[PDB]
Coordinates of C-alpha atoms and ligand atoms in Angstrom, one line a residue:
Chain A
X1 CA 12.8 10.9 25.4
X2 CA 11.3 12.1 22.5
X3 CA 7.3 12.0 22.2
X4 CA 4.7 13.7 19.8
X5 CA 1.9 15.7 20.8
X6 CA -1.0 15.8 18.1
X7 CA -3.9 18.0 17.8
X8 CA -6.4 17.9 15.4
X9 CA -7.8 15.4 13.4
X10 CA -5.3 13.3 10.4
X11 CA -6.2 14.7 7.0
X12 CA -7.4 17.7 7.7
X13 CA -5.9 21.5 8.0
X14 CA -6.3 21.7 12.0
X15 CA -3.8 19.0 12.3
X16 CA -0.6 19.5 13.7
X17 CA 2.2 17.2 15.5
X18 CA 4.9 18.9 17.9
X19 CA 8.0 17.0 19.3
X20 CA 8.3 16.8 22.6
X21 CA 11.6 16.0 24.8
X22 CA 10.5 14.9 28.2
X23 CA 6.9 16.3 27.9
X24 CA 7.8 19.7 26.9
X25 CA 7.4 20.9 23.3
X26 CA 10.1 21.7 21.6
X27 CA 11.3 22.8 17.7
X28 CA 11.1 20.0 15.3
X29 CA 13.6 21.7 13.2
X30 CA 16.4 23.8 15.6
X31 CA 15.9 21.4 19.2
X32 CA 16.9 18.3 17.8
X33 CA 20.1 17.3 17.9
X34 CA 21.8 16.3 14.4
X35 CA 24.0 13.7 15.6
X36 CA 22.7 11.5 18.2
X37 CA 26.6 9.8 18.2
X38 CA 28.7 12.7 17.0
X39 CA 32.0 10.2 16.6
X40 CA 30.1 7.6 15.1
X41 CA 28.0 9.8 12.5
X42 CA 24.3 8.4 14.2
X43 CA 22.2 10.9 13.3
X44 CA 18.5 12.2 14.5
X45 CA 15.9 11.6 11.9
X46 CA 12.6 13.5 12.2
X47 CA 10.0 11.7 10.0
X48 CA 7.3 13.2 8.4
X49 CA 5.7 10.6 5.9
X50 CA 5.0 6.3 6.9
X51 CA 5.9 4.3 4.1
X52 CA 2.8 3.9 1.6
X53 CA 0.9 6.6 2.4
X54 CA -0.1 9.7 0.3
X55 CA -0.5 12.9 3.0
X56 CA 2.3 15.4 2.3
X57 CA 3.3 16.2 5.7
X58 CA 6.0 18.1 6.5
X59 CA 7.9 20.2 9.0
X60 CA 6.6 23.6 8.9
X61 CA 9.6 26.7 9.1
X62 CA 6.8 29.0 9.0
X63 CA 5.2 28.7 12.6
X64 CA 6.5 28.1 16.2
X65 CA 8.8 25.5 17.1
X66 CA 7.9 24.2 13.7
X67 CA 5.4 21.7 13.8
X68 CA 4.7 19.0 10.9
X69 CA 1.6 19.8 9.2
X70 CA -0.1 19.0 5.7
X71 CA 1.0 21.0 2.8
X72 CA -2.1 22.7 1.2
X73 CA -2.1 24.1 -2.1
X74 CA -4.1 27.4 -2.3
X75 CA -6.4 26.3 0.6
X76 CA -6.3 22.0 -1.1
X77 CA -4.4 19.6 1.2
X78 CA -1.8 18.2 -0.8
X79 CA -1.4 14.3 -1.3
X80 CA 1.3 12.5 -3.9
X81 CA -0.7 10.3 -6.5
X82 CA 0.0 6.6 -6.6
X83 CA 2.2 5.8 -9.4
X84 CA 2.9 2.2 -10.8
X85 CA 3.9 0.2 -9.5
X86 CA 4.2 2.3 -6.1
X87 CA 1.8 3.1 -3.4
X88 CA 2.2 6.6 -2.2
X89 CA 5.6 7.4 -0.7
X90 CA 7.9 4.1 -0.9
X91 CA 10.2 5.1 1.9
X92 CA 9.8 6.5 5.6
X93 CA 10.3 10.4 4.3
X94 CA 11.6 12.7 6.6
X95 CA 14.5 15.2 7.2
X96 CA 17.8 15.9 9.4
X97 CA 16.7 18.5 12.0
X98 CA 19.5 21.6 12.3
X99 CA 19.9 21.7 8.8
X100 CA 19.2 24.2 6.2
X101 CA 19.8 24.1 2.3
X102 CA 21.0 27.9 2.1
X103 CA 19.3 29.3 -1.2
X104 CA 21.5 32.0 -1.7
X105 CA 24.7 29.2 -1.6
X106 CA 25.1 26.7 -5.2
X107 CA 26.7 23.6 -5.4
X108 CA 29.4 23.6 -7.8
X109 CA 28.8 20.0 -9.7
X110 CA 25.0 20.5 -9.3
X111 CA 24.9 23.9 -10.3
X112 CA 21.6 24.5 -8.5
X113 CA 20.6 26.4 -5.6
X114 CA 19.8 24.9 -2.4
X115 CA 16.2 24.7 -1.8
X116 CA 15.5 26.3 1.2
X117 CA 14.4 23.3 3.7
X118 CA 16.0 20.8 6.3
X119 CA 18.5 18.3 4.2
X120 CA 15.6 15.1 3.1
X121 CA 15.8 11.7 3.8
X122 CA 15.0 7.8 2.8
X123 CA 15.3 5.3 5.2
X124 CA 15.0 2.1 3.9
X125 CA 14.4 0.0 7.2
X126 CA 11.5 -2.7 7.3
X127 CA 9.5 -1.2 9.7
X128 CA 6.8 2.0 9.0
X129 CA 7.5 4.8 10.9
X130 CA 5.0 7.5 12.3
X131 CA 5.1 11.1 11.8
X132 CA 6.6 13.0 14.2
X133 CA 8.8 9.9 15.4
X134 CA 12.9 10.5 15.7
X135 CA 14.6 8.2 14.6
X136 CA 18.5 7.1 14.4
X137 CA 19.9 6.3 11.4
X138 CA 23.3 5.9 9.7
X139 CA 23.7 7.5 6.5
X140 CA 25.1 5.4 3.3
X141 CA 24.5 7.1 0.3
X142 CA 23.0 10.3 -1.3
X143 CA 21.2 11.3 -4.0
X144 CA 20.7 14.8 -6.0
X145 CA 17.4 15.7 -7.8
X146 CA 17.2 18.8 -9.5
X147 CA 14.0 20.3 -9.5
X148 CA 13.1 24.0 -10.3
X149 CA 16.4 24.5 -10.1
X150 CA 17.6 23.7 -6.9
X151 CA 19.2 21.1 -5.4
X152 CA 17.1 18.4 -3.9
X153 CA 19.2 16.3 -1.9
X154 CA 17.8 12.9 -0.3
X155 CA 19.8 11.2 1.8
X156 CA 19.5 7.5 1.7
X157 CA 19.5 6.1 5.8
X158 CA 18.6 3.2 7.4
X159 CA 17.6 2.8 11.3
X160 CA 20.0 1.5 13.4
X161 CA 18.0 -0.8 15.1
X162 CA 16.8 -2.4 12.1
X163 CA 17.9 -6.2 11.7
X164 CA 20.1 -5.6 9.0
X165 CA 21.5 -2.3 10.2
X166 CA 24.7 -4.1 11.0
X167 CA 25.1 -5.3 7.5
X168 CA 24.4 -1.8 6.1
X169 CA 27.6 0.1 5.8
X170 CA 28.0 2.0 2.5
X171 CA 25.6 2.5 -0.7
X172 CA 26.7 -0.9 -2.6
X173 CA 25.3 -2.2 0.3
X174 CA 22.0 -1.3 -0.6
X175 CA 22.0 -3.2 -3.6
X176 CA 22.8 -5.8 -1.8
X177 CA 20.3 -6.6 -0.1
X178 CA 17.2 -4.4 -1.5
X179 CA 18.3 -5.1 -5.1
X180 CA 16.2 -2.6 -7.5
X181 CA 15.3 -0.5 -4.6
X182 CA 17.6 2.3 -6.0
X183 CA 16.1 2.0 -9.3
X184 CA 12.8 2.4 -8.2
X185 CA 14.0 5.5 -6.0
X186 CA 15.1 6.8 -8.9
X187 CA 11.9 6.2 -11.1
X188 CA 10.0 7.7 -8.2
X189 CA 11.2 10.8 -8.1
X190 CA 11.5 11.3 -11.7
X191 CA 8.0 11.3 -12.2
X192 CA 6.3 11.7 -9.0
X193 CA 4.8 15.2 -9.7
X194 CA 3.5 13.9 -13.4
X195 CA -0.2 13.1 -11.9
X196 CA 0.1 17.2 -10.8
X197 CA 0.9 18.4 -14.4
X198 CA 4.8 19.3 -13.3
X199 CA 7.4 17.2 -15.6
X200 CA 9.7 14.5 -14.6
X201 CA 13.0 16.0 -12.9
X202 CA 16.3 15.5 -13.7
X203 CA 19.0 14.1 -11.6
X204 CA 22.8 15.1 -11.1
X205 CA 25.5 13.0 -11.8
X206 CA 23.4 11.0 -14.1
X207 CA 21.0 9.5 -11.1
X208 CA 24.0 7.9 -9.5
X209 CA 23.4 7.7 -6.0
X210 CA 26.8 9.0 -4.0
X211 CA 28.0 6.9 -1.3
X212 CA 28.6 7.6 2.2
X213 CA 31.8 9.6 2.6
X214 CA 30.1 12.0 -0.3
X215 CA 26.9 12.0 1.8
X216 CA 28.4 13.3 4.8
X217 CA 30.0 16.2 3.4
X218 CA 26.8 17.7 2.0
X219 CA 25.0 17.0 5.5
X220 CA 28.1 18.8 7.3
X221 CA 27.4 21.7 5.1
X222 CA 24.0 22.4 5.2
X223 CA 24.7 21.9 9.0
X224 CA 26.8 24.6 8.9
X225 CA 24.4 26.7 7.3
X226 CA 21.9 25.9 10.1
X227 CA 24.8 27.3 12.3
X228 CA 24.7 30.3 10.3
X229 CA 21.2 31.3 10.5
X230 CA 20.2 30.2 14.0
X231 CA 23.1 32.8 15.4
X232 CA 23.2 35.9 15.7
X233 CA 24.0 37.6 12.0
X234 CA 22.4 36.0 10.2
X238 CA 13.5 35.0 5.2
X239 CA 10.2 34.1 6.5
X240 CA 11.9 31.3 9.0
X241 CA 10.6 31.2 12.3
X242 CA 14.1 30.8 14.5
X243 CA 12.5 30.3 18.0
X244 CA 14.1 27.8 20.4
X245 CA 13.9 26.7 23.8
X246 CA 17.0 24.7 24.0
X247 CA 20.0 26.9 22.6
X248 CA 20.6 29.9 24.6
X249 CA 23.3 31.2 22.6
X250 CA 20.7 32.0 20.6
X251 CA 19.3 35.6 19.9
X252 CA 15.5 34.0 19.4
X253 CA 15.7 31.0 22.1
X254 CA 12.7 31.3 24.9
X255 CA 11.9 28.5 27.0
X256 CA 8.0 30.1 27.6
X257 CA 7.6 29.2 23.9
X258 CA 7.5 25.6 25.0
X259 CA 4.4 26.7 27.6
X260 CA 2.3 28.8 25.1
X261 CA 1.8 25.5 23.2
X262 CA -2.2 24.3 22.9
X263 CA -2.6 20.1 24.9
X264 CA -2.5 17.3 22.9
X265 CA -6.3 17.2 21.4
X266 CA -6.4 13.7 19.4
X267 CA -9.1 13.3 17.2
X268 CA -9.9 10.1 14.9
X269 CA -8.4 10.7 11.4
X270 CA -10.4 12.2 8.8
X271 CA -11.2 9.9 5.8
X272 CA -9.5 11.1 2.6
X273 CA -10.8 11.2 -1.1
X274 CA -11.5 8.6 -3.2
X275 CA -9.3 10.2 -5.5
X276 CA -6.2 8.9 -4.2
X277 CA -7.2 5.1 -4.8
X278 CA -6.4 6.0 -8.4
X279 CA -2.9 4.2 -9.7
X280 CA -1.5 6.0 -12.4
X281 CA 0.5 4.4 -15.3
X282 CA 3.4 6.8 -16.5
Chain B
X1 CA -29.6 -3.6 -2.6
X2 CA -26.9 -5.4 -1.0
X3 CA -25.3 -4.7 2.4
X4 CA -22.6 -6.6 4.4
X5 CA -23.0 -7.3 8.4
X6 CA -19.8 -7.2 9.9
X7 CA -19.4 -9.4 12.9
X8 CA -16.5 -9.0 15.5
X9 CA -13.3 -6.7 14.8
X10 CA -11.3 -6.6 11.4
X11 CA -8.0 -8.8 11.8
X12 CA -9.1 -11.1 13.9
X13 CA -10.2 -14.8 14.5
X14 CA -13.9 -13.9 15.5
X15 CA -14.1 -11.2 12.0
X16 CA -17.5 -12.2 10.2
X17 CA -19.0 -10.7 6.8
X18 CA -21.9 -11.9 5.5
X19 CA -24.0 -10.2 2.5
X20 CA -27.3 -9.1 3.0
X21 CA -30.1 -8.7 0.1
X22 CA -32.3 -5.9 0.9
X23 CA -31.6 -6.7 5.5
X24 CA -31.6 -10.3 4.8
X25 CA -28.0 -12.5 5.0
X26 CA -27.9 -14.4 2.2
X27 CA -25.6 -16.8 1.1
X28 CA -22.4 -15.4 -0.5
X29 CA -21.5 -18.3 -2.5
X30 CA -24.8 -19.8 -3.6
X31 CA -27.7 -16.6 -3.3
X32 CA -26.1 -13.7 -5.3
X33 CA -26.5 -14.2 -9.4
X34 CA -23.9 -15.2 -11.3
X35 CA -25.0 -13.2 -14.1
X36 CA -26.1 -8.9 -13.4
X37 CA -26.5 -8.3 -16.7
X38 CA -26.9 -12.3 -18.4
X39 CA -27.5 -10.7 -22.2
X40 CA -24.4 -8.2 -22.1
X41 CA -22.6 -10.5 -19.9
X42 CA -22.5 -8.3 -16.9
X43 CA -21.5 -10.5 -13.6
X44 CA -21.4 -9.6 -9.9
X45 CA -18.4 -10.5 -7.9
X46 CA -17.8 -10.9 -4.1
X47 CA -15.1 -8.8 -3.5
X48 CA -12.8 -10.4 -0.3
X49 CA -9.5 -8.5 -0.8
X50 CA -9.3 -4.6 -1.0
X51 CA -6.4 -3.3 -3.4
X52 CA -2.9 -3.0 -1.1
X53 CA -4.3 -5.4 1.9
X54 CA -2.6 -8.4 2.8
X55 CA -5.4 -9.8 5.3
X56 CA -6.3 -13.2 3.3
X57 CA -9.8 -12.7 3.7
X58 CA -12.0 -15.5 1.5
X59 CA -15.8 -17.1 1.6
X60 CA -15.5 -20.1 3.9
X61 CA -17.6 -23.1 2.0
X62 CA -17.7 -24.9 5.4
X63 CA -20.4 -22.7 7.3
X64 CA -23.3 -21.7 6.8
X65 CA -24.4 -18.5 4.8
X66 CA -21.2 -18.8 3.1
X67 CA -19.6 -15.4 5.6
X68 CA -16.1 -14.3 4.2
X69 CA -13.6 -14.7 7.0
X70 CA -9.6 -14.7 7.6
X71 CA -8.0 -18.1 6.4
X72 CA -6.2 -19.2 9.2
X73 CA -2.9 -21.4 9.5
X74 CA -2.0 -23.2 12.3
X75 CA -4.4 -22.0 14.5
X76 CA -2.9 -18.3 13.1
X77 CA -4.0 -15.4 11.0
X78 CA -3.4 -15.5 7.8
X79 CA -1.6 -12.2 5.8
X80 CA -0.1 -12.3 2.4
X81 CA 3.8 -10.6 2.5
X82 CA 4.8 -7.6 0.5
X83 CA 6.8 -8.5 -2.4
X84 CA 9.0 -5.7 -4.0
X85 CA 8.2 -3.7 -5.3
X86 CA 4.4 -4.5 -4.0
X87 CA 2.1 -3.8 -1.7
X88 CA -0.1 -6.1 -0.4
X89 CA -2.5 -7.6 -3.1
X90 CA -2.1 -5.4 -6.1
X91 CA -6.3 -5.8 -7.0
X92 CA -9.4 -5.7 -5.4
X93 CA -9.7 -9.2 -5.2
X94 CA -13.0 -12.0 -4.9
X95 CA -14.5 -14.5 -6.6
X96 CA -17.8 -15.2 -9.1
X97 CA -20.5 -16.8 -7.2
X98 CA -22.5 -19.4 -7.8
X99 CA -19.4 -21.0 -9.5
X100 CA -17.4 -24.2 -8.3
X101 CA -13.8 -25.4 -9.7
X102 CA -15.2 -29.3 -9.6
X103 CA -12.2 -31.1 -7.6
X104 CA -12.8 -34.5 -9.4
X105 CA -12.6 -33.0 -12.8
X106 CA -9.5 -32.2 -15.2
X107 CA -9.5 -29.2 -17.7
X108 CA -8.4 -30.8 -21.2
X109 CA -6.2 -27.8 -21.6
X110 CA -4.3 -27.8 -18.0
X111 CA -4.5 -31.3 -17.2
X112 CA -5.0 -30.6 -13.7
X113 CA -8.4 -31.0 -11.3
X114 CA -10.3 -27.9 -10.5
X115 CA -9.3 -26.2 -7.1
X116 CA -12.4 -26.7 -5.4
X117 CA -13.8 -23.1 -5.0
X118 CA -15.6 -20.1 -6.8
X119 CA -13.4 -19.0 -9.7
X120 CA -11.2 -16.2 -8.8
X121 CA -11.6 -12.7 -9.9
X122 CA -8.9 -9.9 -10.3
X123 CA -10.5 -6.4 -10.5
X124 CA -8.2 -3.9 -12.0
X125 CA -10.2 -0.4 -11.3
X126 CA -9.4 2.7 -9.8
X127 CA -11.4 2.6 -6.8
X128 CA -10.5 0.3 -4.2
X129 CA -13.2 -1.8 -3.1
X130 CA -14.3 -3.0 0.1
X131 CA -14.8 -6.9 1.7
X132 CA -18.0 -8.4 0.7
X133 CA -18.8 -5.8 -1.8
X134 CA -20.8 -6.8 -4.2
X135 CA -19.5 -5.4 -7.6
X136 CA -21.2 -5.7 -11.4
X137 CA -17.7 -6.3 -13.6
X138 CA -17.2 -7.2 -17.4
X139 CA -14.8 -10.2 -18.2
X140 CA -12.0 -9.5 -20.2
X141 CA -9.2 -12.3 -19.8
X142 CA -8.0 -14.9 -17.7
X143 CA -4.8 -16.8 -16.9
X144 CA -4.0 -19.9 -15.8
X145 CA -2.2 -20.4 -12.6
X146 CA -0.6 -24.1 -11.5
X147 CA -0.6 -24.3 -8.0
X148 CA -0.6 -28.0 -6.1
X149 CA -1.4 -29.8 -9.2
X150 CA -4.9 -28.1 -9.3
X151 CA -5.7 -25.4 -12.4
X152 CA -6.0 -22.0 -10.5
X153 CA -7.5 -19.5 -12.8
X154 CA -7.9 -16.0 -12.3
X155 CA -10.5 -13.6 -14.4
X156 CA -9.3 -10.7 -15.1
X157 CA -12.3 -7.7 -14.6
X158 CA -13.1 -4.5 -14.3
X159 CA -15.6 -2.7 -12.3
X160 CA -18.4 -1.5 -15.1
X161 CA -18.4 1.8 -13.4
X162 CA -14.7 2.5 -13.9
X163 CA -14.0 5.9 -16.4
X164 CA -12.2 3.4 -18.6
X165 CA -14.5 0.5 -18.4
X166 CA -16.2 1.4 -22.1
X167 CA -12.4 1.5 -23.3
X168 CA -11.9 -2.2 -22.2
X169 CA -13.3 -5.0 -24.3
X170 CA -10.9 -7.9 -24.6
X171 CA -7.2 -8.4 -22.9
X172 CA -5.5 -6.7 -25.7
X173 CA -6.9 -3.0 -24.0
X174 CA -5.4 -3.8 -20.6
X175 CA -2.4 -3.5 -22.1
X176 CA -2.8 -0.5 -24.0
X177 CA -4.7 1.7 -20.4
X178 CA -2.4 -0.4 -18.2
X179 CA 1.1 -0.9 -19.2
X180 CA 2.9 -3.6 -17.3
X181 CA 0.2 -4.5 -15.0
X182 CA -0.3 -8.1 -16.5
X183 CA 3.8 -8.8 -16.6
X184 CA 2.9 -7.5 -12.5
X185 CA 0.2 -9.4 -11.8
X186 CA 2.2 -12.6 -13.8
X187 CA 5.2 -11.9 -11.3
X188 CA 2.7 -11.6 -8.2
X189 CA 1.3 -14.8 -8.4
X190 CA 4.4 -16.8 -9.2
X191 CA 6.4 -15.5 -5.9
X192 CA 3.6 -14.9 -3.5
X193 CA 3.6 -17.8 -1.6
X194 CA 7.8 -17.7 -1.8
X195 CA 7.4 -15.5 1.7
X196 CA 5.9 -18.8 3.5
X197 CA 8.2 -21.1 2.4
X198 CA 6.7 -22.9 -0.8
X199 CA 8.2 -22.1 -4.2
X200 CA 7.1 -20.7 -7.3
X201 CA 3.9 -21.4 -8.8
X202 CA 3.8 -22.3 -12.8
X203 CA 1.6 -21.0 -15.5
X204 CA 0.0 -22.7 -18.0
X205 CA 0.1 -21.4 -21.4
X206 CA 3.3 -19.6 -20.8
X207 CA 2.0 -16.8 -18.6
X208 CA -0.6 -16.1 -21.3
X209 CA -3.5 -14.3 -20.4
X210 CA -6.5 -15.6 -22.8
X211 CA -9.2 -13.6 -24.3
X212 CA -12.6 -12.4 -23.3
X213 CA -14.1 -15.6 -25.6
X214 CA -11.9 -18.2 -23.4
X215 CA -12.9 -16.4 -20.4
X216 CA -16.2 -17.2 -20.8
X217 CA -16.1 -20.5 -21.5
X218 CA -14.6 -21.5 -18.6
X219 CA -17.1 -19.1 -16.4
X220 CA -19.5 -20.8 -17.7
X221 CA -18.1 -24.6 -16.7
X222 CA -17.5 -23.5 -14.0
X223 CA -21.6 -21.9 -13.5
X224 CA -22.1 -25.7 -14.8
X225 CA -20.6 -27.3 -12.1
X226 CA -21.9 -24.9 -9.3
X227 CA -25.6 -26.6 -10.6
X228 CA -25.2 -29.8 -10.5
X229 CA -23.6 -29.0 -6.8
X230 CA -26.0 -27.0 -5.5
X231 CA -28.6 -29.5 -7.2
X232 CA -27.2 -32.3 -4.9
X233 CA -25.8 -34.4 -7.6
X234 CA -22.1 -33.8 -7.1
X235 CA -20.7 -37.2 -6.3
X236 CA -18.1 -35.5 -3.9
X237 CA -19.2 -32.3 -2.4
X238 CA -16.7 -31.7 -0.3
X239 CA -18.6 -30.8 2.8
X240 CA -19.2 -28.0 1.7
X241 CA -22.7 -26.5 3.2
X242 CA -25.1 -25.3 0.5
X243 CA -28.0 -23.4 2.9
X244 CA -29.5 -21.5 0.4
X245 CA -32.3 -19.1 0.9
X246 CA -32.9 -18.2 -2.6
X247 CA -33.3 -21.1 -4.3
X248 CA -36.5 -23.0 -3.6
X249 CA -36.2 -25.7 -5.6
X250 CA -32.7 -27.2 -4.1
X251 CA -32.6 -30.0 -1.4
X252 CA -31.0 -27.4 0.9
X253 CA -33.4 -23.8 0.6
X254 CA -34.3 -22.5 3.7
X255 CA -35.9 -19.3 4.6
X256 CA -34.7 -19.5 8.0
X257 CA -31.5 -19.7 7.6
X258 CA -31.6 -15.7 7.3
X259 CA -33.0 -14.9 10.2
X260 CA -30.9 -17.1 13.0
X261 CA -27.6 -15.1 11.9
X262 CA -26.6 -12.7 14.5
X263 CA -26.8 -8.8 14.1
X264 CA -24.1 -6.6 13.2
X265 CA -21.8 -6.7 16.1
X266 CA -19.2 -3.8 14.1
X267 CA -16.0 -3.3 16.6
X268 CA -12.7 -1.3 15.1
X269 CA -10.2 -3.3 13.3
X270 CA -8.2 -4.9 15.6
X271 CA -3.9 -3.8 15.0
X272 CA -2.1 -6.2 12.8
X273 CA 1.7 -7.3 13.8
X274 CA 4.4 -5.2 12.5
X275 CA 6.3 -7.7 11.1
X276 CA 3.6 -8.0 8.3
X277 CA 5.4 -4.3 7.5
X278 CA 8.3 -6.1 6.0
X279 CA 9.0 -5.7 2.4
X280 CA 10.7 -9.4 0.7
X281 CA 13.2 -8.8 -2.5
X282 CA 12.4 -12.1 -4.3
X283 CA 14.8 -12.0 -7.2
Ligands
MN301 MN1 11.6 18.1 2.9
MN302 MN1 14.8 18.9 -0.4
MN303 MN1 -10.7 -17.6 -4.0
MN304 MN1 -8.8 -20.4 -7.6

């Protein structure tokens, strides 16, 4: 069972969420499985951003077993700006644990390099998630931004145990049943980072969102470069594990060394981020 | 100044706002002046809806001091769905007080009777505002929704402290800072109710959003009406209750009103179902 042990105060730089499996800590980004039904392609999701909010939260490779925490900008906390007709993020944001887009490796048709972080992902279900909740989803499509040069990936999911899961099998799907929501996902990321001064970025194969079979291979492969770096010959990436032993940097005390949960009432944010821009 | 006194927790049946003037609860609907600013044309609204809530929170005519509460149905809480590709109510909204849409009255232009409550304000700012705020806004438009065979206009505003406010004049310049937010809010209000089972709502003009100038005139009726209400010589008043404490000479003033209104009883918001999470695609 998978449970979340915050500390600190939402909104703030103290706060920080850790996964925990049974009560123990361990990392959010090497301890999770990937698949949670190998044969039947369920995968583990680990989500780091509810649905219509603004905090950009995120799984942190920088510290010990890699807990999600609010990406600052020079010693700001970073939030995404509302953009019409949106309200902060329009999709449960997360990412696939035991998955790394290798930098060093670009992708042919994309002509990119990876960018350096667990494989992203949407899912579309109807429910809001919370941060630091694991999820299982079933992958049905992909897209590919390209931003700063690298391949941005997200990988469109839904939860399994959503309602229309069942009906969900393949991108066209989508479309089906959340008609426009692709467009908007599309919209959304091309000018998300306007408010912050950045341009809009571009998108591979014209903005066409991959389906499934497409999806899987580019999961598969930054899977396998997981593999790669968590063994032995292989930066800044902190590689400590407590549940693979194979492992040159696994160590169950790191589990032990990890500060009690220390809940604290969120922090308000700025008035700032009311503000609905109109690009 | 004006305060609010929140009674009970947020989301549900026993949540209470009333206004106060300066400590005092007054009456939301009949104490606070229609008119800020009555030479510029500066009005305060009641703000009963926050920007991306979907509590239906409104001024209940039928008690007294006029507290905003959560329209129930069925003996249930009341929450608007969200329709793709929005959240919630997409303005702060509330109403004009001291304003009454007269029930046994047709608009010339609408054919239809008045809906029986303060006209309807849509503030488009950047700030999101909170319930039983009370806001100074400048009128700029209003449109003209058909709902039940009853004229339900809707003002559109703008809080006169918002960094664009001095740019905004008449309906033209919503257009021009807001791009696509009226062809929005049109959309909004004709599939909102589609969630709950009732069907589109019409518009009359064609959608058309009418000038400041029109806006105005109707505010004004609609100020007329609230007088010869809260003057007791409405032939139907609805039973609606019109305890005033500002307003000596009325038929209903009363001073003590204020003071047997229990204190601020703030608890934290109570949690609000998950299904209200779901997102409809109303095409
Ligand atoms: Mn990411
Ligand atoms: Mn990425
Ligand atoms: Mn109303
Ligand atoms: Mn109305």
């Amino acid at each position: 069972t998978y449970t979340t042990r915050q500390i600190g105060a939402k909104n703030t730089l103290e706060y920080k969420v850790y996964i925990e499996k049974d009560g123990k800590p361990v990392s959010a980004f090497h301890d999770i499985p990937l698949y949670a039904d190998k044969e039947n392609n369920i995968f583990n999701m680990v989500v780091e951003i509810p649905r219509w909010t603004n905090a950009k939260l995120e799984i942190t490779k920088e510290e010990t077993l890699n807990p999600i925490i609010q990406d600052t900008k020079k010693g700001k906390l970073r939030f995404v700006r509302n953009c019409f007709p949106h309200h902060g993020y329009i999709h449960n944001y997360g990412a696939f644990p035991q998955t790394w887009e290798d930098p060093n490796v670009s992708h042919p048709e994309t002509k990119a390099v990876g960018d350096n972080d667990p494989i992203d992902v949407l899912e579309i279900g109807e429910t809001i998630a919370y941060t630091g909740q694991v999820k299982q989803v079933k992958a049905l499509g992909i897209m590919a931004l390209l931003d700063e040069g690298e391949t941005d990936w997200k990988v469109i999911a839904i939860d399994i145990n959503d309602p229309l899961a069942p009906k969900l099998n393949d991108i066209e799907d989508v479309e089906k049943y959340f008609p426009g929501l692709l467009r908007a996902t599309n919209e959304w990321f091309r000018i998300y980072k306007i408010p912050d001064g950045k341009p809009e970025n571009q998108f591979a194969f014209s903005g066409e969102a991959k389906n499934k079979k497409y999806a899987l291979d580019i999961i598969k492969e930054t899977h396998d470069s997981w593999k790669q770096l968590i063994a032995g010959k292989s930066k800044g990436i902190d590689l400590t594990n407590v549940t693979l032993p194979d492992t040159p940097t696994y160590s169950k005390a790191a589990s032990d060394a990890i500060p009690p949960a220390s809940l604290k009432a969120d922090a308000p944010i700025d008035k700032s981020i009311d503000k609905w821009f109109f690009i």
